[PDB]
Amino acid sequence: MEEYVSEFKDMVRKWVPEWEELSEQKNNVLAQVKDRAITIEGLKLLSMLVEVDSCKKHSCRHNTRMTVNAILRELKVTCPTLPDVTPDGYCMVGDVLILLEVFVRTSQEAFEKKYNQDFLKLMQLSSDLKRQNITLVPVIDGRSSYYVEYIPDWVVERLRWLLLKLMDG
Amino acid sequence: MEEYVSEFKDMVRKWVPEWEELSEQKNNVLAQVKDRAITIEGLKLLSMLVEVDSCKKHSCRHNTRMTVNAILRELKVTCPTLPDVTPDGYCMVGDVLILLEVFVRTSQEAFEKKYNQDFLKLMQLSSDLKRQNITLVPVIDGRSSYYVEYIPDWVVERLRWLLLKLMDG
Numbered sequence: 001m002e003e004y005v006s007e008f009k010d011m012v013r014k015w016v017p018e019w020e021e022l023s024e025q026k027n028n029v030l031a032q033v034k035d036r037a038i039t040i041e042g043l044k045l046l047s048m049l050v051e052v053d054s055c056k057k058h059s060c061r062h063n064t065r066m067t068v069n070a071i072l073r074e075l076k077v078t079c080p081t082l083p084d085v086t087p088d089g090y091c092m093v094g095d096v097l098i099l100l101e102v103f104v105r106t107s108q109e110a111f112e113k114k115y116n117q118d119f120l121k122l123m124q125l126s127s128d129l130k131r132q133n134i135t136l137v138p139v140i141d142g143r144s145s146y147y148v149e150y151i152p153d154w155v156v157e158r159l160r161w162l163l164l165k166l167m168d169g
Numbered sequence: 170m171e172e173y174v175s176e177f178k179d180m181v182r183k184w185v186p187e188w189e190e191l192s193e194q195k196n197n198v199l200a201q202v203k204d205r206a207i208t209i210e211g212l213k214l215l216s217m218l219v220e221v222d223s224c225k226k227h228s229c230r231h232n233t234r235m236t237v238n239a240i241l242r243e244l245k246v247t248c249p250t251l252p253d254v255t256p257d258g259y260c261m262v263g264d265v266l267i268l269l270e271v272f273v274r275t276s277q278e279a280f281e282k283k284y285n286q287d288f289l290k291l292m293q294l295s296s297d298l299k300r301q302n303i304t305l306v307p308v309i310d311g312r313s314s315y316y317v318e319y320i321p322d323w324v325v326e327r328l329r330w331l332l333l334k335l336m337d338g
Contacts, residue, residue, distance in 0.1 A: 057288075057292070057307070058306050058307070058308075059265075059304055059306055093262050093263050093264075093265045094262050094263050095262075096228075096262045096265075098306070108277035108280075108313070111277075112313040112314075115311075115313075119226075123226070135228055137227050137228055137267070137308075138226070138227070139227075139306075139308055142284075142311060144277070144281040144284075145281075
């Protein structure tokens with residue numbers, strides 16, 4: 001009965017690399033046993049996969065739970081308190097800070113909307129950073145689907161398609 | 170008769186900054202006298218405006234007529250011959266090269282299509298650059314309209330709306 005669930009755990013175990021950035025959320029998914037639960041971690045992962053894709057593409061460190069303030073303390077950057085933006089990835093090259101935000105939106109409109117919300121959440125930091133001699137380069141990665149480099153697109157679509165099967169009810 | 174043309178030259182003269190990056194194409198537009206002609210430079214400018222917007226936002230030098238090979242000779246970078254990609258803006262921070270491509274696409278599909286074509290045109294350079302100790306960070310700025318920071322959006326829409334009036338025929 002309902003082995004969309006196990007094929008799904010099976011696909012995950014196979015196709016999601018043993019990368020450190022992903023080990024956490026992968027062990028989440030593969031630990032779940034309840035249907036509802038597995039489906040939730042599933043969505044969390046789909047998103048993480050696309051985020052870690054962007055990170056790699058843009059050569060950015062992945063972020064899961066840090067504010068920019070927390071990040072800059074990591075980076076040994078002196079800065080006054082900024083708003084607690086939670087960027088998806090980041091990278092500091094000299095005086096240049098790249099904050100990377102990622103989303104997937106299929107509603108052409110709910111999308112571009114989301115684009116600006118994200119570009120705005122970031123640029124608002126620009127000027128305070130600049131006062132502290134940090135050039136903020138903001139990168140927003142709007143995606144209309146969940147494809148990633150390191151996984152065959154035919155597999156992504158099955159993976160997501162799998163979750164919808166599971167969601168019914 | 171038909172002073173969409175002059176209001177248009179009037180708007181241009183007023184709202185397009187006296188920036189160097191834009192002086193060229195602005196003097197183009199304001200020099201035109203024929204209807205068809207003015208309309209062409211008009212489109213070239215609308216695009217340039219959105220490109221120079223992106224450049225500023227991402228703190229990139231604007232490019233109008235250089236290949237990446239030409240660019241890197243400018244940057245004193247040693248590199249074998251790459252394909253003659255023509256990026257919209259660029260910036261070299263240490264060993265990191267940012268190539269910025271910009272497009273405006275309103276067809277949700279003709280858009281994301283255009284997104285990849287552009288991300289692909291860029292990444293193809295990635296590995297050869299890396300062999301030469303240059304980390305390529307590619308930035309694609311997909312836009313669903315022509316708005317820019319330094320010009321009121323109500324004015325952009327009038328500006329473009331103006332061109333359609335002119336195009337009829």
